[PDB]
Design a binder for this molecule. Structure first.
Ligand SMILES: [Mg+2]
Ligand SMILES: [Mg+2]
Lengths: 230, 230
């Protein structure tokens, strides 16, 4: 019997692109006004900085919020601001980015289904990103929410899955992870010993030899799918 | 005595930022027109694909045009388009980017100075980017123009500098490189045995032990600086 069901956030519970596009635009406009010494910055330029940081410390890849604040800092300093005002503007502009990326549209299928599942399963979140369920309508459905930045390591590494299993106190064979990414969610959870349900609403083809343990196109299929393994 | 002067392009012969920003926007606009299925894509989403390609083939960093075309390809195809239409769209959208990329405003100090220098020195270009002087009114001042994409290796590696010396048929002690970047241009050229002149119009501070052989804020200072080493 399945005791634990964990879920990926971006493109599993909502479409990721729109809220991140809006967040970028918001970050952009706030800098144009509040840091007018930085000026129109090509995507190319933040990346140059980002890549230097990742070369100096590759583990930054698992700390996406810290990484972005640091990139913003270096860009600001390098455009003329005092170390102190740069840090302070970096901090403020990031908080504007982060408020923006939380303006997501949760799929309609999500709340009704989480409510059903919570009657019978312990539920958790495992995300590489910086969407925080407490900021959304969702904190109360989940026993816990894990993110790579707090762990210092992200999916598909075993660590985040093992930590979920620890917090629930269940063995891998009693757990299912649900997500949209073939490598991060599916292969990741399976290599940690769990079952994995692939969320594929657009009906994409699967191309790895090990199959998802199930595939769905709508989250409200979860209760029937999980009952298979009861 | 000085026979060869080589010059970096971006941020030494013109401001880097504006033409590239315009290019990104033109690229953005043309794709909303001819590739409606891709839709508004977060900068973050291109970085992931870019990062993926740089993983399978790290030498992609020296092929910036080819790299962008491949990233455009994968985003279009992974947006639904067939391998055929993706590739034609990638290729076409890239040419639009590249055209916009060449709408630079050459510093007024440049042409008058190149004309003077050309009378007594061999002039060359050494760049990691995809600005092509042949597409600009500047082509006639230069004997050669090396880019990292054609050499498969970029500054600060000594290879592009050593190639320049071979094209001009002179020894390193007979050569000077002019550039804005402390590592790519200055340290790079000096480690290859050349003299290096730091283009620093904004009056930034220099913080490496080894000094640029000279520092200027206006390209028209070159004739007098070069005369020091005659
Ligand atoms: Mg996801
Ligand atoms: Mg440059």
């Amino acid at each position: 019997m399945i005791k634990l069901v964990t879920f990926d956030l971006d493109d599993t519970l909502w479409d990721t692109a729109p809220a991140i596009v809006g967040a970028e635009a918001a970050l952009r406009d706030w800098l144009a006004e509040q840091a007018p010494k930085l000026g129109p910055v090509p995507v190319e330029h933040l990346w140059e900085i980002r890549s230097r940081l990742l070369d100096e410390d590759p583990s930054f890849k698992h700390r996406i919020s810290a990484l972005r604040r640091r990139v913003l800092f270096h860009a600001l300093e390098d455009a003329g601001y005092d170390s102190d005002e740069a840090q302070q503007l970096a901090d403020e502009s990031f908080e504007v980015f982060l408020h923006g990326r939380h303006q997501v549209q949760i799929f309609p299928e999500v709340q009704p289904t989480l409510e059903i599942l919570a009657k019978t399963f312990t539920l958790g979140v495992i995300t590489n990103g910086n969407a925080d369920v407490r900021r959304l309508g969702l904190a109360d459905y989940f026993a816990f929410a894990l993110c790579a930045e707090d762990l210092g390591i992200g999916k598909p590494d075993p660590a985040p899955f093992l930590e979920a299993l620890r917090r629930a106190k269940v063995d891998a064979s009693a757990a299912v992870h649900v997500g949209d990414h073939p490598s991060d969610d599916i292969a990741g959870a399976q290599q940690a010993g769990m079952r994995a349900i692939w969320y594929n609403p657009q009906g994409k083809a699967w191309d790895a030899d090990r199959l998802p343990d199930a595939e769905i196109h709508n989250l409200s299929q979860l209760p029937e799918v999980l009952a298979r393994w009861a």
